[PDB]
Amino acid sequence: SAPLGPFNATLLEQLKNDYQKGEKEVTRYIELQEKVAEKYIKMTPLSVTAKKKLPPSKDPRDYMTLSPYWWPDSTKIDGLPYIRKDGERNPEVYEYPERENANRFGDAAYCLGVLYYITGKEVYAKACANHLRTWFTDPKLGMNPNMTYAQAVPGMKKMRGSGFIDSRRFSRALGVAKLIEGSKSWTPSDKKKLDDWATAFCYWMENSTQGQRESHAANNHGLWYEAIHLMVLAYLDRTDRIREVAEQSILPKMGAQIADDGSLPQELKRTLSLHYSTFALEALMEANQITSQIGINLWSTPASNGKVASQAVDYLYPFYLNPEDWKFKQIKPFDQSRAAILLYEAGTALGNQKYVDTAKRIGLKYSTSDVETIPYLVLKK
Amino acid sequence: ASAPLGPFNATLLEQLKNDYQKGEKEVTRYIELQEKVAEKYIKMTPLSVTAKKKLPPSKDPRDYMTLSPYWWPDSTKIDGLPYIRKDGERNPEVYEYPERENANRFGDAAYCLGVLYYITGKEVYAKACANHLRTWFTDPKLGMNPNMTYAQAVPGMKKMRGSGFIDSRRFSRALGVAKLIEGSKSWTPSDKKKLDDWATAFCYWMENSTQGQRESHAANNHGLWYEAIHLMVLAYLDRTDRIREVAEQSILPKMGAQIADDGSLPQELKRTLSLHYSTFALEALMEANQITSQIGINLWSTPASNGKVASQAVDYLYPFYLNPEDWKFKQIKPFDQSRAAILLYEAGTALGNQKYVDTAKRIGLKYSTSDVETIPYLVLKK
């Protein structure tokens, strides 16, 4: 049985088992992924401190990014304070290296971690460990365990926590560290430091004013917060807390956002409504990969108010077939391949065969290098 | 009191200089706002194309290099090579090439400083402009090689391309506004000579390289924007007969082939940003006409050999400039209606169409905006 972690544990165990028995189709797929994975073996570990502009703390170990929809105001002489343009990403975001480097880190470590779980080769754990240490625990290059300055806005005078969503990138990688435990490269001392980082980040999530705020939001930010919350709690083996967050936080939050038709009214008022409708469920989808390893299915468990997350997939299914029909503002094209993983996750969990069949029709490219598709051989022809 | 030939609306700019000298309150108010906007360019350290780590294939940091914005790594290839195209979707990798945004910042600064010197006469603005011009263009270590070989390159593509020449309009407008500072104490006769020599060299590359040749023959918005940049360079060099030849032998035939009988731009209707690329082609004619009209050639009303006129394109688009909602073609991003204001004002005054000029002012530009391309257009603010 796979260690508790941020992935579909069924598909992952299936892959390792077929790989060990020698099944051709899986062994060929894994030898693809290994060729894809070779850039991460040579790839030099990134660190949050690779930045020139420092944050208010003057500490380069603090993660800092710009909130993507905030732009300078031309009608002010300094451009300050920034004004918002929902859905239109300000290219200034890319002057904060963490925004893209946390992605590159997260991808590298997830891929290396799952390949060491499937194949068992020390070269994959040894490379994953190098990435984990430099990003999280290294006394000089690892990030502080907080997200105070995530998605900061210049000229804004209050502090906000909407930026906590940036954590999904590196917190998936935190969980997968559990997969290389037992390797020769991940020493007891390595695990302890990462446990202590994970313990500190969790304390920051739960008790900081920004974390408390985010823990209370009944929108897609609250769902993503709790999904990230489960990943940290899963890494630390706090399964009772996983049960309590699922039942006391995620399901109530999910039920307040679903309307009687299954739509998500808070996301239909965005400039990117089909994207943000799917973003919300993607939070629930990643949380459910962790809850269902301990027996809790968030797709089919109803909330106190009777709403259940399957109603929200039903509303969106027609448009996942024919995205033209989306009768709401979508100021940018929508990636139909996001429906493939979502409908398989939700279809496998709900015993809905129409969903699983449509997931396979849409599919993912067999040879793609997107690391989040590594588990989904079942979607790749 | 006539403005030197350059890449701006000379009527609006002479009017502003005239009114500011006479003491008119409303212009003096506006120019003092512009001066507060322009102080950041006085302090701004000059930019240079050489501020980059990743070198071009020539291994010369003085070569301008950018990435073609719509080209993306291919996930199904082990190295992502060769890149593939997604029309309309900017690959954020473009921001790893510093010249993409630094040429904009440079261009904006030198243009703002040049126009304010023309209007106010203040040497502080000629001195600041000249600083930006020397570092970008002529400096023997920091200045830019006079070419666009590696503009909008594409990783994995085997042939060389010319369509990235469009990147030139940023620093090219700045090249022309150097004419406004000639005669200051700060722009010495030697500064003029090097810059003249640089512009002669860049114009040579534009006209004789394989890439510039291709670009001079495209009958799309790239060909139009090529000649509009060509006119900036030839105006700066005072080659006014060439301006007349380029207008009658290239711009007019190109405009004549790209306008259909209903006044639409077929080539632009097929892009994923059809309302943006229709306006783009026209803005090429607008910026070329600001120059051609200073030597007596009105590109909005002068027909091609087939009797097509550029005013026919404005007519096709005017109703959509009112209600962009009605645009019945692919537009995978929102359309900025302020672009129409300058366009409609520029075409309206050249064509005598009051309906156009009224619509321009109704849309308007923000009085306090710091966007330097709106500096001449007080008439669209207020």
From TrEMBL, chain A:
GO CC, any one term: periplasmic space
Could you tell me what this protein is called?
Alginate lyase family protein
Q: Which InterPro entries match?
A: Alginate_lyase_dom (IPR008397), Chondroitin_lyas (IPR008929)
Family matches, as SUPFAM superfamilies: Chondroitin AC/alginate lyase
Question: Domain of life, per the record?
Answer: Bacteria
Residue ranges occupied by any Alginate lyase domain in the UniProt entry: 47-326
Which species does this protein come from?
A: Bacteroides ovatus
Which keywords belong to this entry? Lyase, Signal
